Write a protein that binds this DNA or RNA. Structure first.
Length: 266
RNA sequence: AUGAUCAGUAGCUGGUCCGAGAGGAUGAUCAGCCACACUGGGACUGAGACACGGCCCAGACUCCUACGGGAGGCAGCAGUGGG
RNA sequence: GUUAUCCGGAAUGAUUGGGCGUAAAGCGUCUGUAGGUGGCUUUUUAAGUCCGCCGUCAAAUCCCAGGGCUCAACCCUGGACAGGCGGUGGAAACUACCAAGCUGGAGUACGGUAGGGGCAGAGGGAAUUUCCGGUGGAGCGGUGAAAUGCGUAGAGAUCGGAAAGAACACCAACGGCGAAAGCACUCUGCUGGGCCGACACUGACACUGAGAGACGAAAGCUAGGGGAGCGAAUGGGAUUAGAUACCCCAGUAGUCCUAGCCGUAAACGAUGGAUACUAGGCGCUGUGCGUAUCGACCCGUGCAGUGUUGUAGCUAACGCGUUAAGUAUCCCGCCUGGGGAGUACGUUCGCAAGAAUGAAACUCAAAGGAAUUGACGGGGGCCCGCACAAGCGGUGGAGCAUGUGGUUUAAUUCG
RNA sequence: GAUGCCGAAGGCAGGGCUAGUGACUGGAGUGAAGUCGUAACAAGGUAGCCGUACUGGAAGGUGCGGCUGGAUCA
RNA sequence: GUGAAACUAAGUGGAGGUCCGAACCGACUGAUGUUGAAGAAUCAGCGGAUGAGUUGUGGUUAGGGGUGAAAUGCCACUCG
RNA sequence: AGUAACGCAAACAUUGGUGAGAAUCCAAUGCCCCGAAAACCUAAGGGUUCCUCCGCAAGGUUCGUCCACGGAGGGUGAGUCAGGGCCUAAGAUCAGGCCGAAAGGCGUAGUCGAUGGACAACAGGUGAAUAUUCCUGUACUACCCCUUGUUGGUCCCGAGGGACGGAGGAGGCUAGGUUAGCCGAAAGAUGGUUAUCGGUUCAAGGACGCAAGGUGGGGUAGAGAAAAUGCCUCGAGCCAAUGUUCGAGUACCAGGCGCUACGGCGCUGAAGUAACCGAUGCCAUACUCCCAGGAAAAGCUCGAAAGACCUUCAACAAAAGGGUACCUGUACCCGAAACCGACACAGGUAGGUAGGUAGAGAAUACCUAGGGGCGCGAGACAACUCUCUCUAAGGAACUCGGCAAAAUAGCCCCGUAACUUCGGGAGAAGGGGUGCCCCCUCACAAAGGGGGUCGAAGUGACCAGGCCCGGGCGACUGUUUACCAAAAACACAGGUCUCCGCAAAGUCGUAAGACCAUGUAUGGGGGCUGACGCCUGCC
RNA sequence: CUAUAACGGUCCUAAGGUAGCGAAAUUCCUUGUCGGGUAAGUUCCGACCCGCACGAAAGGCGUAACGAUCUGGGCACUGUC
RNA sequence: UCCGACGGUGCCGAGUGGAAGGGCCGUCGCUCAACGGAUAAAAGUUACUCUAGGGAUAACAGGCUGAUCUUCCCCAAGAGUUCACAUCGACGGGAAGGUUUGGCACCUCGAUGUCGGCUCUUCGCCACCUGGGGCUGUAGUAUGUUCCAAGGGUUGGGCUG
């Protein structure tokens, strides 16, 4: 840790120390996915089970404009770890929005064109100096996708660029997307919240997904490779079904091809 | 902590040896005091020793035996063995 | 006579008697409890201290004077001493206690000054690298030479634009600030210390300080970010007898930020802090004054800071020299041969790497400091010989003479 | 006499501490002055050393920070 | 106790796939059986036991295909 | 071969009745076993196997006047229970439509389907077999219509309320139990005993809404948005186990009086209170804490640009009137021999109630209620086999292996090594006491501290770890070859490499569609490795 | 002084196995050798070591606790003998 | 062999006249070697195994046979101080027995369970001990060798299956 509110670390005593939640909810939920990795005919792509899910919620695109706000209190949501608060616009529109950084006390929070740049709400990139700290960009002028993982959701820019295309995605290198888009302009979601360690699985891993490791475990049928006294013919192409883990490369197009540039591969 | 407790070592002092002195090292002989006297423990007698040459019990040794059972201990003087 | 053993020689633990810039030695720097020390006046106490006296300090040793064994050793009279402790009757300057003050100590307020002091948040300029596009050509990069590498899927160079990180020229100065470490582009916000000046006020409320608490260059470590350049490691090229170095082309951790941790350095002025004194000549910052300051300036008076053929003095010498290792006082830390060691063991601290405290056996008789003479130097300054350079001829090639090694031989004699 | 308290000899379990010893093993001090380098001392010829980190037959090399008990006109 | 912090000594509280042990679940070892009670379990011991635990009911995937902490087991006393 | 077997080792016999005959039928006197069970109730399934009167060749691995056997009759009567009926999850189907050779797949409006949610009573008595349904006493809910009072009502809704989750830690209170009082009976076949045994019950509804550690009102104004934003005047509402009354000056009830085919029915019928201690029960769908922060709809309530309605129809309430509340199952069994396994095979199988004594305990052992003796016996009784007791000296010396046994195994207290990421091992190891009575209080529910005393033994019964040392491997818990191997196998978290800014990669599919994520590179997917510590070289 | 011979020379490769460990569940001959345990022990433990085919995350070297794991020893208790 | 290239030959050539093609004469292409050559073109495992058959085809074992192995014996230079044979005995030879190592693989793969230990034995012999004898470089006490004879008896543990 390097910032305040250090992550609690359960000292030794008995391998690990699970827990038992207990809270309340107030509307703002449909039912969320509750069928486990399936399809109705074939599970497809194994690894995925365990209960403890539900609770979906919404609010992403944000069509509201020049409307003040007031972040009431903070709140956490399953799956994605980066808070979501509950805010409270000047008028009284019940929403959530991705919890920026320095807030909780309400702060400003406001969307629309020509608004105070800091970490309010939606704000068209068309009106942005450099953009050293955005948040969640959108492929189009209406969606709210891309890096929605508030935590670590970073994507610098290139000061002022024409042709209506900039954005500097993290591990995704740099690409070109419409400029007529908007974002929360937060680019924050706490990094220490994910800095913590799982522990030793059991009551922390399975409670979210089935075993992630498979191993050779022999059996030429159960897996493209296997057999032998104990060792495994690794490297000799052993991916589940013609895959190819040694890079190779994918995603091939010609017309609607990738508009990303630079993209270094070391 | 102006240092308890613990561990190693040791009788104390008057004095002795050295040193110009201070100090340092010791305290054999003579004398005062303390402690012990086969080892551990205990009491009795008596003004006083719970007492080398007193008693009782236990232990390790030495010696006697009709082995049933008993007798001793110089860290008093002179001496023996041993070191 | 030898050996053993204590003391002396050892002012080599020094209380009388020593030291810590370089020889062993100030802990890396502050704050601060206990402890040690503490300005000036009067009164008082008089505990310490001092005077006298009364007890005890056994005798015998030791010492002084005097006796007896024919001397002496030895024995012996009296005295001295037993440096101490307690008590009583005094003395009162000093130290200490108590009371009332004073002020030069120290502290505070008022008004100003300088500074990279510190923390946080912004913003500014050059350059480097990278991405895209234009122009254009075959070379570029690099070295003592080269090569690896980048190049005609066309770099470099050049121009336009973008992204990003770090440090921030000049001013910078023998400068300044800070306890130390350390800290410099500009701005704002909060904040510490130092200094001067007419003063106003308290009033010694002080100094130092084991333990303890806090701060710590860089490197390193934990978690999360960032990453232009540089660059441990590592991979190639080159050099070389070899180089798993120096040098060349790349390059990871790291270097940067937040938080926590480790606490070490020629943490060096290698000379701990505080105070009072002792010859002088030049360089900063505040303030007073100087025909009305007519001026760049002139004459003082304080803080901090260099050099000095720096004097006395001090020092082994080098050197220091009122910011002295000069003359003194207060208190704390440290050393008392070299190697082994600042390691081993144990305790404590740490995530780890390790830090702190700290031995002995054995072994040598030497380690070490300054300075002196000379030599040496792929150190410097200046100078002389075919010494080089300028030039001619020659050797090493050839046949032959001769000398020497090696070989051979009974010897192929010796130097 | 019996009984009870205290109680030495002696007995049991588990620790601390100390001396001796121990396959094997680390570092260190010496002796022929052997083998491979020559790292330091004159800028010893990439100045040296201190702390720290990594690497290497070895002396040692390299990075960062710092000092000079560094030569030189820089 | 420190200027304020970490610290420490009680109490409170309460976590831990924790410890012991029934129901339950899962089953290592020995014996009795193995034309047996039973086409394989019982008896005397053992492991787990608020847990990635277990169970009742219903549904979704099913063979060259599904599922699988994959034994290539299982897919209803059969099966790579 | 007529050998074995006649199916857990919870033994059985006797006096009578009936019959041709009965050890196993029935009746009576007992033994014995179980006692959170081989009791009862209920779901699934089964499904008439329940009851009664008869018969029995076959089915009951003995007979049988016995039977869940056969052959004839009789018997499941609730608007409140349950299933239909409203609503809804996984999921199925699914107009038009999107797709696919045909077939068909997928999928929405909409429409089905639960172990989910939503209105309403019990206590007695009666019958050979049923009963919260028959009967008696006392109550409740919803709809329609009517009467009275008041008031504006009003869709496939908006909003509120419904939707419940973990674990852990306090108190009260209830089932129920014990003691005492009271009532009734017996006061007694070896001594003593005027005191022994039994009962002491009692539901909903309604009122009460219970000294309470559960959970800020009200009024006015606002064309965009509004889980809403500003003032004023006073501050004291919901939810809720239990108890106390009415309900029961009743019924029930020990025990009698009569009858009796003797199984059982009529009549009558006293006491019916208090104190102490409860639980994994209830208020706690709570609260505290914590985090892997964990269904939907309807019923209900309220509001609806007061659109449609508009002296109306309706809404609320009152008589807590009157009428109505249609259709089915509901017998028996149900960790049981009528269920699932070919049988009456000790195998397997969800939920609920569940007492006394000792004990922490639904442990264990012995007793209640209640349910059984498991359906071949009697003698003999040697070898041998199966399940066990007790066993001189020594002691594993057996053996592939101390397998199998034995033993250890209670609580409190004292004490406890190497090592440690120092959480542990430490329930190490190794010891002592705890019985009973009396006294201190002639009880402060226990416990402790003294004294005295009994037996060989005092957790003395059941129940109830064996410990220590060194070493290989896997960190561990967990999972796995369901019916011989469950292990250093597998799994696990940690680390790293690689692919994807996406209608994803990738997986299912000829397609559509869809899973993967309504997430998103501290995401996710695939491979190897795989706790941590020191490290992970050259090519 | 034998061995050792760290040194050197030479041939062959992409580079030629570093640290640690090693007769270890992976060295046939090794029933190995030395030392400890036993009256005796090809079993086990501690080392040396000439590891025939140990070896760095298809992991190497350690490692508290944990496991109905595998191997060996001792005490109490056992006719298991 | 078949598939094909090309020349010659008016042989034929599906309406006719030609042609393509075919036929005939002549030649060429195939480590087609596993070469009387199955394809133009095709390597392994199966301790998961399954099925059809046989011992005419193996493994344990019986049997035939049996060089090797075991035992005994002949000639005999020498060792044993001397001396060949108390004992032993080189260079070679002849047999018995039969449990070793093999061949055979004759009878059994519509099957006869491998080793070892434990329990309980049976027989023979060139029996180690007890008994009766010869020689002895056997003094005695004890041994060496040989002959008859087994009547009987003939061990407990550490380690390893």
């Amino acid at each position: 840790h390097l910032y305040k509110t250090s992550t609690s670390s359960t000292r030794n005593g008995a391998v690990q120390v699970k827990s038992n939640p207990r809270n309340n909810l107030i509307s703002g939920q449909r039912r969320c996915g509750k069928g486990r990795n399936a399809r109705g005919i074939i599970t497809a792509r194994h690894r995925g089970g365990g209960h403890k899910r539900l609770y979906r919620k919404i609010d992403f695109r944000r069509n509201e404009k020049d409307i003040y706000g007031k972040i009431v209190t903070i709140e956490y949501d399953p799956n994605r770890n980066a808070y979501i608060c509950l805010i409270h616009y000047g008028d009284g529109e019940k929403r959530y929005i991705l919890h920026p950084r320095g807030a909780i006390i309400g702060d400003t929070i406001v969307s629309g064109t020509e608004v105070p740049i800091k970490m309010g709400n939606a704000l068209p990139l068309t009106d942005m100096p450099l953009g050293t700290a955005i948040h969640n960009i959108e492929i189009t002028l209406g969606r709210g996708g891309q890096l929605a993982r508030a935590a670590g959701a970073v994507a610098k820019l290139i000061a002022k660029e024409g042709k209506s295309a900039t954005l500097k995605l993290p591990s995704g290198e740099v690409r070109l997307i419409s400029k007529n888009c908007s974002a929360t302009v937060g680019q924050v979601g706490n990094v220490g919240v994910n800095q913590k360690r799982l522990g030793r699985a059991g009551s922390k891993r399975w409670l979210g997904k089935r075993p992630v490791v498979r191993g050779v475990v022999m059996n030429p049928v159960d897996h493209p490779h296997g057999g032998g006294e104990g060792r495994a013919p690794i490297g000799r192409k052993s991916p589940t079904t013609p895959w190819g883990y040694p890079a190779l490369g994918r995603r091939s197009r010609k017309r609607n091809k990738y508009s990303d540039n630079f993209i270094i591969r070391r």
